[PDB]
Design a protein around this nucleic acid. Sequence first.
RNA 1: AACGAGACUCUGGCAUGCUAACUAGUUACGCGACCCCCGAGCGGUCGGCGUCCCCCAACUUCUUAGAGGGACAAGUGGCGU
Lengths: 126, 313
Amino acid sequence: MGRVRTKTVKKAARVIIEKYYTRLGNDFHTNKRVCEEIAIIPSKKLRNKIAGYVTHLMKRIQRGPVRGISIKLQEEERERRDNYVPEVSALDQEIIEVDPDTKEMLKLLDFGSLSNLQVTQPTVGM
Amino acid sequence: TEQMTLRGTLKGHNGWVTQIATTPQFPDMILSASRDKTIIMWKLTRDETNYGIPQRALRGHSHFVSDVVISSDGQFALSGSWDGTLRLWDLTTGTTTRRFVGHTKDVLSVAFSSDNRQIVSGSRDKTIKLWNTLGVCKYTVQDESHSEWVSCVRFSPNSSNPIIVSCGWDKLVKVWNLANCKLKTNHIGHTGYLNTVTVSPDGSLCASGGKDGQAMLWDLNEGKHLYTLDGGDIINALCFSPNRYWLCAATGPSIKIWDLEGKIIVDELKQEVISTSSKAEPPQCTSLAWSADGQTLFAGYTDNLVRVWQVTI
RNA sequence: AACGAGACUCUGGCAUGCUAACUAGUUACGCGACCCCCGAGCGGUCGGCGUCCCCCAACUUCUUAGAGGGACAAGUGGCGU
């Protein structure tokens, strides 16, 4: 057994998926022949490996985002989460009130609106 | 109303069904190719216990048989294979008439003309090439060719004029006219590589698809972009109907049969829904072809089966 | 980032696919010769036994050695963050 993939495979596998993302299928044989044309792998046995790992990565890339390499459409959805989230447009719900000892600060700083009072019991853990 | 019932399913392969075709001369035959490196000729009993038995099995290839097509007489049959060669069968016992020698890479697509005198080939050479029935090269196309692999070529039925379709992975569809062998036109469209193309039985249309999975319609002689339809994730094979203006689109979990007039989906064919997870819970459908009756259609899958359906009113 | 490990080279295991062979074979007859009726028949012929005859025959499965393809944890079910 054994046969844990080396770094020479994992380095180029990531690269080949980033710049030829479109050409990929999810079949072994198709992904082999693409790697043969978009690059030269100087061995035959090495080629049969790099294809198989390119296949095995492409399975996971069709789920959530991989943390070793980037593709375009994930950076799209990244941007779409990072410019507005549907949760709020209001700040925060527009009116939030506070309890005393905060009101005393506001009293001495010329503010006197939009408050509630509750004088919660003593004390820490008690 | 015209709807679909699950007819039955055939068995007799160790490799994924790549193509299926049927001659209208004998609709009681049906022909198949597969990645078990053999093309199987069937014997169709119409019993619902089975739906057919393999009659003979044509043998002799060292790599996959990609596409297969029948003769107009039904007495010959031809194959294109990923060993870089083609064969010309005599579908009565076996015994290849001719093997066509010369390609440096796979022969993906292949088609057989109406007059039975011109045979074309798409290759990962990035060359369309023409072939005499004697097995020699009438012409080779290496100028104004695709810059990527040739996905599928077609002979066009016409009034008499010579026109042949070509489409590659360079996201273009080239139409060629013989006896100058020039670009009739270039059609641009589809993001991502093109899988397939097919021509209407009347012959003025090219329904194309690919990685995009959208079905764009082109005009052969007008040269106009009619419209586009959302055909799902990916469409690997297409086939018009012989007795209707429908179009049957092969997507992964389902086959989408579309009425064209008006433009709407009739039904979606679902097969067995057996519990499996998670990347392709059913096998992808990859090829499909109508019978000349137009009642029954067949499908190629990657579980090594050909599922049959039938139209019921 | 580098050396060693791996990658690499050779060898074995998979080709009725490809390439081609009287300093390699097979098959087919043409055979005529020998042999025994040994089986149907009569001893001939048909069938069986090897050798000589073999070609301007056919073929390359066997033998030979070259170009290629094939195996990747590839697919499925468990398990592992």
